[PDB]
Amino acid sequence: SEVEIKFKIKLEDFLHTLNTFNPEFVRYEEQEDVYFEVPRPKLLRIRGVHNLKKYYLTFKEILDENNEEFYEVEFEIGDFEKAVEVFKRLGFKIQATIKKKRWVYKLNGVTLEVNRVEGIGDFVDIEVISDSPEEAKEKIWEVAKMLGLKEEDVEPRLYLELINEL
Amino acid sequence: SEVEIKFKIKLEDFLHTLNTFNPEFVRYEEQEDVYFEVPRPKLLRIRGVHNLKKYYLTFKEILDENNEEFYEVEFEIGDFEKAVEVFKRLGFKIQATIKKKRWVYKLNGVTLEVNRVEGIGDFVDIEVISDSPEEAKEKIWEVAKMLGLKEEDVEPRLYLELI
Numbered sequence: 167s168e169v170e171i172k173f174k175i176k177l178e179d180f181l182h183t184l185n186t187f188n189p190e191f192v193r194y195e196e197q198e199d200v201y202f203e204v205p206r207p208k209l210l211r212i213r214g215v216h217n218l219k220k221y222y223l224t225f226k227e228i229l230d231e232n233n234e235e236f237y238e239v240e241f242e243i244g245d246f247e248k249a250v251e252v253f254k255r256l257g258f259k260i261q262a263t264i265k266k267k268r269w270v271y272k273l274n275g276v277t278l279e280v281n282r283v284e285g286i287g288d289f290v291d292i293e294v295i296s297d298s299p300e301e302a303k304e305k306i307w308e309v310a311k312m313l314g315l316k317e318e319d320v321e322p323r324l325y326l327e328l329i330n331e332l
Numbered sequence: 333s334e335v336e337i338k339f340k341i342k343l344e345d346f347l348h349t350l351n352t353f354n355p356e357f358v359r360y361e362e363q364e365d366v367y368f369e370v371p372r373p374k375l376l377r378i379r380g381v382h383n384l385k386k387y388y389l390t391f392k393e394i395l396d397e398n399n400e401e402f403y404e405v406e407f408e409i410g411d412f413e414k415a416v417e418v419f420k421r422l423g424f425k426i427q428a429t430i431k432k433k434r435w436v437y438k439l440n441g442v443t444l445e446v447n448r449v450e451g452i453g454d455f456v457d458i459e460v461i462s463d464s465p466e467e468a469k470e471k472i473w474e475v476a477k478m479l480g481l482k483e484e485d486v487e488p489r490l491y492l493e494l495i
């Protein structure tokens with residue numbers, strides 16, 4: 167039960183704003199995400215993290231039209247390419263491939279995921295893992311307003327949707 | 333690129349017989365294999381090796397008529413139950429759960445997998461990873477004859493079918 171809101175940013179401006187509140191740095195990932203076509207509201211992707219030599223298989227159910235609410239199951243895998251192969255051979259089509267750099271920062275009960283996404287742009291995802299969407303969204307909006315972010319900065323589309331449109 | 337012949341055995345007899353030839357030891361595995369329904373000639377399972385705390389996803393494609401040649405793609409996964417959950421949520425159906433105890437050896441350039449399969453019986457798989465079915469099939473039969481295994485011992489049906 168992830169609650170999440172995504173904001174368009176200019177990474178440069180935003181890293182000043184962020185250093186001002188100087189949050190805890192968690193981790194850095196150079197990610198390659200391969201999405202496979204599945205009926206909505208499902209998502210299926212294999213992620214490779216080049217810099218860490220880690221790989222993941224992720225399944226999500228999108229739980230609302232906003233794309234702010236997700237059920238997720240994920241686990242590590244030993245081999246990126248073999249997983250992609252298996253799914254191809256199972257007759258799944260590759261819907262999109264997405265490259266991005268991501269810095270994860272933490273505050274009290276909130277995660278900030280600063281994303282630089284090849285061919286699309288820069289975004290911050292403000293996330294809370296909660297069993298209560300309303301309270302979660304309030305925390306996220308408090309953080310966003312603290313960082314000078316507006317409703318007009320909200321990106322409602324999935325990166326998958328943005329790459330396909332782009 | 334895998335060639336594999338499966339034989340019915342009695343576990344202890346075969347192990348005694350096998351040991352007279354000084355096989356190399358590899359490992360012992362307590363396995364649980366969950367098969368999902370996929371179309372022919374494919375196989376898809378998630379394997380849990382409880383005693384080693386290792387979990388795998390294994391895809392296989394049967395390349396011949398007698399279930400003896402397979403193209404296999406497999407890799408480790410970090411969570412057995414989550415992998416089962418993902419495949420269920422993608423709409424795959426569990427076809428069977430197979431629990432077995434397995435003793436792995438290498439002998440004369442083949443691999444032997446001695447299995448006690450729960451609710452089914454004991455078998456040995458003799459296999460070589462190679463790109464030459466006819467030659468690999470003869471190298472297996474060489475070892476198999478030597479271990480006293482005959483044509484009537486051969487089990488051509490998959491554990492999945494044998495339920």
Ligand SMILES: [Pt+2]
Pocket residue numbers: 440474475478
């Ligand atoms: Pt021999």
